[PDB]
Design a protein around this ligand. Structure first.
Ligand SMILES: Nc1nc2c(ncn2[C@@H]2O[C@@H]3COP(=O)(O)O[C@H]4[C@@H](O)[C@H](n5cnc6c(=O)[nH]c(N)nc65)O[C@@H]4COP(=O)(O)O[C@H]3[C@H]2O)c(=O)[nH]1
Ligand SMILES: [Ca+2]
Ligand SMILES: [Ca+2]
Lengths: 193, 193
């Protein structure tokens, strides 16, 4: 019946994590851009880019997904407040996106960790949760998280969801291209509006 | 038609937390009890006690809801793995339960963290989530988690849910006394079985 784990997962992810880290993340990115743009020959986008593989495949490191997605630098932390903000642990990692060995873009990137739960659920037989259930909830997770972020206080502008199914043959899918296409569209939006 | 956050919250709580902390819990408690017995003739119960206040009120200090519930120690981490078998580092607290100033029991005690999500949602206006909704979802949370632990590999024997609805009239609920009942029933079971 009407059992959708994705509903709770998306709400939990926003309330217990994204809501808490997005303002501080944008603040650190801005500062980083101020001190290091001369060094970067560009700018890190201020949107957290969230990877949502619909196959729920989350690797411990990003480069084993795509050798054109490569660690660049660390985002410095917040400054000497320590007044209640430091609860979650999130990635201070900036990635560069490569095209032909050349840096084509830069962003803060991370996977949507609740997809791990759906994967775990699908390997846990007592849950009675099929691969087909997993994909269905993964999609529902995306839709739900999207709706939440649409009405969220300036957080729609604070992150970008990158949902993607991967070729059920084996074409060499390019995640780096997927991300770059969003980066280019974002800069285009930022500049034509 | 049915949006039930509690479903995903309970699955997320078992998958992302209980499944990982519980298999090694009783070993951690056992090695603490060796010292606890030798040093104070103490015995800490072997089950994780999970407070589920139906009103979703989670304080950042247990002792603030009851000074008959007195902090004793952190439960020390496991051994062998440099990685941790299943854990990075789980903070778990051991508490003494007091009756008329006297130590009457000892257990690893903590609130069900997903109740905070339910509480935050009910203060988040974009959620259209009322305090009546929260309670119904809190009940569903307990029910769902219970069903999960019942099918779960020995994790059911590893923990005990303490779900309580507090009297609206600001009557004299004793949380310490509620916990002691469970502790006294646990000892009765282990001693009769
Ligand atoms: N990248 C990143 N993502 C984060 C972080 N914190 C939370 N998230 C994401 O948001 C989800 C919801 O977290 P939650 O509301 O704290 O909800 C948690 C919480 O209620 C509970 N839980 C998890 N770890 C602990 C713990 O160490 N102690 C206790 N008492 N509860 C825990 O189980 C729920 C499910 O946890 P998850 O499966 O891990 O699911 C997490 C996770 O996917 C973070 O610091 N970094
Ligand atoms: Ca993949
Ligand atoms: Ca209460």
């Amino acid at each position: 019946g009407n059992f959708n784990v994705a509903h709770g997962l998306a709400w939990s992810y926003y309330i217990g994590y994204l809501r808490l880290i997005l303002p501080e993340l944008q603040a650190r990115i801005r500062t980083y851009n101020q001190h290091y743009n001369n060094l970067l020959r560009g700018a890190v986008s201020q949107r957290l880019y969230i990877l949502l593989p619909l196959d729920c495949g989350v690797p411990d490191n990003l480069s084993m997904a795509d050798p054109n997605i490569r660690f660049l630098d660390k985002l410095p932390q917040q400054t000497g407040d320590r007044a209640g903000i430091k609860d979650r642990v999130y990635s201070n990692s900036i990635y560069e996106l490569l095209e032909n060995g050349q840096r084509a873009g830069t962003c803060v990137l991370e996977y949507a960790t609740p997809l791990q739960t759906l994967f775990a659920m699908s390997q846990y037989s007592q849950a009675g949760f099929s691969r087909e259930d997993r994909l269905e909830q993964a999609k529902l997770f995306c839709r739900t998280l999207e709706d939440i972020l649409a009405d969220a206080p300036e957080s729609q502008n604070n992150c970008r969801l990158i949902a993607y199914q991967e070729p059920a043959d084996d074409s060499s899918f390019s995640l780096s291209q997927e991300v770059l296409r969003h980066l280019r569209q974002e800069e285009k939006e930022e500049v034509t509006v």
